Protein backbone atom coordinates (compact mmCIF):
# COMPACT_ATOMS: atom_id res chain seq x y z
CA UNK A 1 0.00 0.00 0.00
CA UNK A 2 2.53 2.37 0.96
CA UNK A 3 6.01 2.26 -0.74
CA UNK A 4 9.11 3.09 0.47
CA UNK A 5 9.76 6.72 1.42
CA UNK A 6 13.98 6.18 0.99
CA UNK A 7 14.59 5.81 -3.08
CA UNK A 8 17.46 3.99 -4.60
CA UNK A 9 18.80 7.78 -5.74
CA UNK A 10 17.98 9.57 -2.43
CA UNK A 11 19.47 7.19 -0.92
CA UNK A 12 23.01 7.18 -2.55
CA UNK A 13 22.77 11.33 -2.58
CA UNK A 14 22.11 11.10 1.27
CA UNK A 15 24.87 8.54 1.78
CA UNK A 16 26.97 11.25 0.35
CA UNK A 17 26.27 14.03 1.82
CA UNK A 18 26.09 11.81 5.66
CA UNK A 19 22.63 12.96 5.30
CA UNK A 20 19.62 11.07 6.75
CA UNK A 21 15.97 10.79 4.98
CA UNK A 22 14.85 11.35 8.69
CA UNK A 23 15.85 14.55 9.02
CA UNK A 24 14.25 15.42 5.19
CA UNK A 25 10.46 15.81 4.67
CA UNK A 26 9.23 14.09 1.56
CA UNK A 27 6.71 15.47 -0.81
CA UNK A 28 6.58 12.57 -3.12
CA UNK A 29 3.48 10.00 -4.11
CA UNK A 30 2.54 9.54 -0.62
CA UNK A 31 5.01 11.80 1.46
CA UNK A 32 8.16 9.58 -0.02
CA UNK A 33 11.44 11.90 -0.47
CA UNK A 34 12.22 13.20 -3.86
CA UNK A 35 15.52 14.68 -5.19
CA UNK A 36 13.85 18.29 -4.68
CA UNK A 37 13.53 17.53 -0.67
CA UNK A 38 17.47 16.03 -0.75
CA UNK A 39 18.41 18.75 -2.63
CA UNK A 40 16.81 21.51 -0.25
CA UNK A 41 18.06 20.22 2.56
CA UNK A 42 21.27 20.51 1.93
CA UNK A 43 20.51 23.80 0.46
CA UNK A 44 19.87 25.36 3.83
CA UNK A 45 22.39 23.15 5.94
Known sequence: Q?????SPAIRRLLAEHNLDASAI???????????????????KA
Do not use: F, I, S
Not at 2 to 6: G, H, Q, T
Open 25 to 43: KGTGVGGRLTREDVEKHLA
Open 2 to 6: NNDAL
